[PDB]
Automatic annotation (TrEMBL), chains A, C:
It comes from Babesia microti (strain RI). CDD domains: NAD_bind_2_Glu_DH. Keywords: NAD, Nucleotide-binding, Oxidoreductase. The keyword NAD applies. This is Glutamate dehydrogenase.
């Protein structure tokens, strides 16, 4: 270690000593940003998840604190003219948090709730999710308080062009590669890409999420669902002594893109998806959904925009239960894949699932499992695969999109899928090894926290802590 | 969904007669903007007429097409240089950067006294849609100068190339504009220009294609167009003729240059029998075909000796020469015709001969070999015609693979480049078939090439906000 | 007017209607930045000072609101290694608020209290002070929460070099020209300039406050005090029909640079400075301070850092009064120059000064006169010269430094002094004309607000409101 | 030069900058927005502008530019949209020196 002299704290520490030092760090962060409620909470949660590391060496807490300040934040006025001809002014942001492992990488959100505190919390966490993919990507987040609701296509184009007119000054294929998020989908990525190309006079991979006709990648629609199943499959192999999805009844929540493609990949591995759900309720097939049944569901959700209940018209064996969660299904469940929304799986749901025989949970959505539900699973020895690792398939394929642009070569769908699978294999092994190394064996939540943090921390010291 | 609908004045379906009128209004508008650019007006007209089925589904595509007809950027610049006598000379340089929707401007440079803006605009406009067909991320462009290489010493061409690149370097780059060779710009000129660009930019990047393999060049460049023609026809035979192949097929090839030579070689790899070669003096014929050994002898005669096809009889007792006649006149059954000589070489009478002789498919190695009247004969006879803009795009496709190798900083083996070229022709053939079936009629590959090339640019143009 | 269609609000409005609209604007600013207390107050105060303008045309209220959003804010981590060899991380800022009239211009502050709210409030007001100078300068402000107190020269050098390592990316002679402020004096300007020149490999006027040996200007130390006296001198001539400083007893508060050089220029104009003050009390000379006496006072304050009472050892005629303000002095006072701090001159002080014969007040400090003190002076018809105009001499000379750097020519001290006097001559005339046009004749406070704002607003519309 | 008019429809105009000679200084010359504008006219004005600018004795070269954009019948906002789009490309080729 060539950076040892730079840090004051050193050596092992007890749990109470770690809590005191973490409290001092949190208070320091609060004084710097007294009212960034979301950012303070994110710093607190990540720090507490790193206690096993901090007990081995307190130097890592000081490194963690130095990582908590963004390298660069740009806020800017965005003037644009609406269809009535009136000048409107919105605020744009790009939080470039850390570039230790690669260019700043992270999505853009257009929503009236957007502010600096929210983007700092999302960008801070994005550093460590991107680290987990094993790809050379840093962490960032951006967006605007622009509200797409009620806006014409032309107004979104005017805003997008003005937004990128400033943003282009600060981004680039080797500097910062933004992506989509809430309020920033295919329409907005295309409008911004066109503006960026016109101003820079170049065709480069400065945005991900692009259409395959101009620099985009295959597997993007399937990325998050496929990666979730790959990760659970490898955790089953590594931690459950050669276990697999084969023959396992899998309760899936949600019926969007994540749930649909997770079900498809579960079937490829021999698993049996038994449920899908939406806000109205869940449907249940006692002997499972087949690929043909999933295709019918996909048509209903993506074309007709129907409820899951419509599927009973196409299957005589299907049952619908209104106003209920998929976790309520009366049958043995071996695997739970919450793929709908945050806080969808609460303590009571976890107690049901344990009794039904659930051995592993894979989070496709963001923060689906409540803290109390996670405690129930941990006490019962039910493995939980954290979303920060398990739903990283989308950001993983965005990194593969960067590689394809750098190579000026479009990969086949099969090659992208093989690359994604190898990424999820190494991520699962790194989570297992990190957890075992720090004396919390089988705790994949801790293993994901440690593996993401440590690669950034060690690389940061390698680079001189600049 | 449709995010650009509100931007377009023309919209909705239209009859064939309505489309014909709108095309006339577009042509007249293009003429008024550039009254004396005869070649460019003709190019706009020919491409427009090939897209009538698309315009009938939605007139917005005609408005997109008109907007694509205006270059994003044209740079004209004085090029001063000093000749071997010590006298100052001034020539005009051009770079037409026509469209970058699908990727960096891509297109060759031409040094010839005939060069002017109208010619470079017609070549650059059509190049947008051929480069789209390669499936690679390449835009469209063209450039050059009225500098005349004839009579010039090596040092004088070096002097001009350096001054020309002194200005051009300001407007090009590996992610912006990647020029290539053309008439008057071969390896000598590519080498001289690359040295000047490297010196001024202080960088080693793939800003030109056609480079020597020792510094950034690619294998398969000599063979690219001939091999790609045969790859394309082979895939059309399998997909549209229910598993048919080159195997066992007697192949009448016209021309005896690089396209014809390497097309014959790949025909043999696939089991076909090339029976003819030709030049302006006549055609030679082998009743039992040419072998690779025989093609090798012919290549030496043409590329070194600069001889006529008749010289080959000196090396083969089975060969026969027929003066002042086309290869299509050969008296024997021909299953595949590959015109690889020049435009308008296959006329109505030749097509009528070929149908009676048993021709099932035509593959265009040359540019516009088949006359309009010959194409109508083939259509009635159900003889597939593979358009040249798709079938002879192998050369530009390999130029794209050269960019890929430079971006990756890795020189591929001959075998890897060849596999990639074959895969490009497979996806191009599928796209032509699918576009023809969806928009005009199954098996009309000429219509499918026009539609597939245009639509990828037009849809991407709308994705990007029409900027 | 080519931008009329862009604005939703237009046309004249009553005073009460304008009050409602201003409240709506304040609420919008509040929701955008809920906890930026200093910035909200700055926007409120400037808006209320422009109410006469809004009454003629509400479009000016929409323009004012669009100006309240910075064009660009850059925040960045500043890593540096202290003398103990420990890595320290501070936050750096540059608020580039507005560039309508010229490059962003404004000082840098190194002080532990610095945050985004404070720099935005100072940067916003800097737009309109710089506009008043008549020079082509926009508005900005920057700095860091770095605390110079207790730091070695080498530690300040290390921080300055790391700070400018990032800042240089966003500034330039035609883009943004920072200057000094609290915590950033000659030492810090020199360290930052050396780093900027080394990285940019160029010698340009990208900082002001430079030493005269390398791009600096004369009159920089004296600029604010001299400019205050020039401004009052011209207001006395223009609004009081040929009055002047000659023969006038001048009560000055404070004993720092502004008070010292204002006193010297008062003597040059035939005035008599009678008082100086500091936190401990005020000193009084019944027959006034001479230039020699001011030189002694300057040595006591700038060297030795003594109290004003120490001057009594050098003058038998001097009198010291502990725990009192200069305004309490028992003698006729003709001119008041508050040069100490904000809110130092309250209602009771104004009532004293009117009785002592005060005809004009010139603000050397920022907002020295309380609103109730201003009410007293208006009733008595005592002119108040607002600080935003009267203390603009420092920024005016910073603009003259830019002109000298652009011309690659060092002006003589006399030429700089002449241009500074002409600037104050035009500034005073512009303030009076603005007040007359809007029917607030003789209200120099309103005239300064209107003249500063209108030049920016009209130029902003000229340029397409981008 | 692509720009969107007040009806929301995309319009395409041609922009030009003829940088004729910089021997005595930066290219100097006006911009003309008129439906008659084409390369021949701008070259004739730009060529002559070299020598008028020379006569001033100041360090100015010669150029001329503009567009076939027609201001007549256009709203203030439509002119703003075209001007911003026109300068979006032109800025790449101009500068104070
Ligand atoms: N796909 C990605 O790569 C990606 C990226 C970022 C975040 N995510 C996260 O993943 C989750 C959704 O992924 P997605 O792309 O599949 O989104 P999606 O296409 O909108 O599908 C979400 C599914 O969850 C259901 N859902 C929402 N609230 C529910 C509730 N209270 N109870 C039951 N079902 C509910 C929705 O049904 P309704 O139709 O009734 O709403 C829908 O079927 C969210 O947590 C999201 O933030 C995914
Ligand atoms: N190779 C490429 O990169 C490429 C790509 C796309 C399209 N093409 C097109 O393909 C055609 C040939 O290309 P290439 O590389 O083979 O050129 P090449 O080396 O000049 O060969 C052309 C051949 O055609 C013959 N020919 C010319 N006019 C003829 C006529 N009226 N009747 C019969 N034969 C005639 C020539 O014989 P003479 O010596 O008697 O003229 C020569 O043997 C041209 O249309 C070219 O533009 C080439
Ligand atoms: N100089 C400039 O160009 C410039 C730039 C920006 C703002 N200003 C404003 O101008 C004012 C002073 O400028 P300066 O450079 O002369 O500052 P300075 O060098 O600190 O002098 C300030 C003087 O005011 C005195 N003072 C402070 N609080 C006082 C109080 N409550 N009662 C009496 N005296 C008090 C100080 O005495 P102690 O030593 O006892 O505190 C000192 O003598 C401030 O309002 C400042 O914000 C000036």
């Amino acid at each position: 270690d060539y950076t040892r002299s730079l840090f004051t704290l050193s050596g092992p520490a007890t749990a109470s000593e770690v809590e005191k030092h973490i409290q001092n760090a949190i208070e320091f962060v609060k004084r710097r940003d007294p009212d960034q409620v979301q950012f303070i909470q994110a710093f607190t949660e990540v720090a507490n998840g790193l206690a096993p590391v901090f007990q081995t060496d307190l130097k890592y807490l000081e490194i963690f604190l130095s990582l908590s300040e963004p390298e660069r934040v740009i806020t800017f006025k965005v003037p644009w003219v609406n269809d009535a001809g009136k000048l409107m002014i919105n605020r744009g942001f790009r939080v470039q948090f850390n570039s230790t492992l690669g260019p700043y990488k992270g999505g853009l959100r257009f929503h009236p709730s957007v502010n600096l505190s929210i983007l700092k919390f999302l960008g801070f966490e994005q550093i460590f999710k991107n680290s987990l993919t094993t790809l050379a990507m840093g962490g960032g987040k951006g967006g605007s308080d622009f509200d797409p609701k009620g806006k014409s296509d032309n107004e979104v184009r005017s805003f997008c062009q003005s937004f990128m007119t400033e943003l282009q000054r600060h981004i680039g294929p080797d500097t910062d590669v933004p992506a989509g998020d809430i309020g920033v989908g295919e329409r907005e990525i295309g409008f911004m890409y066109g503006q960026y190309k016109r101003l820079s006079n170049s065709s480069t991979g400065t945005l991900t999420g692009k259409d395959p006709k101009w620099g985009g990648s295959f597997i993007r629609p399937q990325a998050t669902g496929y990666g979730l199943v790959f990760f659970v499959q490898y955790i089953l192999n590594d931690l459950h002594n050669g276990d697999s999805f084969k023959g396992k009844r899998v309760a899936i929540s949600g019926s969007g893109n994540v749930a649909q493609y997770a079900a498809d990949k579960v079937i490829d591995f021999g698993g049996i998806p038994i449920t899908f759900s939406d806000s109205s309720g869940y449907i249940y097939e006692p002997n499972g959904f087949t690929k043909e049944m999933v295709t019918v569901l996909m048509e209903l959700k993506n074309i007709q925009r129907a409820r899951v209940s419509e599927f009973l018209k196409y299957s005589n064996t299907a049952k619908f239960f209104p106003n209920k969660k998929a976790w309520d299904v009366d049958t043995n469940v071996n695997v739970a894949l919450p793929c709908a929304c945050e806080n969808e799986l609460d303590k009571a749901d976890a107690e049901m699932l344990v009794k039904k025989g659930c051995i592993i949970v894979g989070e496709g959505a963001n923060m689906p499992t409540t803290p109390e539900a996670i405690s129930v699973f941990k006490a019962a020895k039910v493995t939980v695969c954290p979303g920060k690792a398990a739903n990283a398939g989308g950001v993983a394929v965005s990194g593969l999109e960067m590689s394809q642009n750098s190579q000026r070569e479009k990969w086949t769908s099969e090659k992208v899928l093989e690359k994604l699978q190898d990424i999820m294999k190494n991520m699962s092994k790194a989570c297992q090894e990190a957890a075992a190394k720090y004396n919390v064996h089988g705790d994949i939540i801790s293993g994901a926290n440690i593996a993401g943090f440590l690669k950034v921390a060690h690389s940061y010291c390698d680079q001189g802590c600049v």
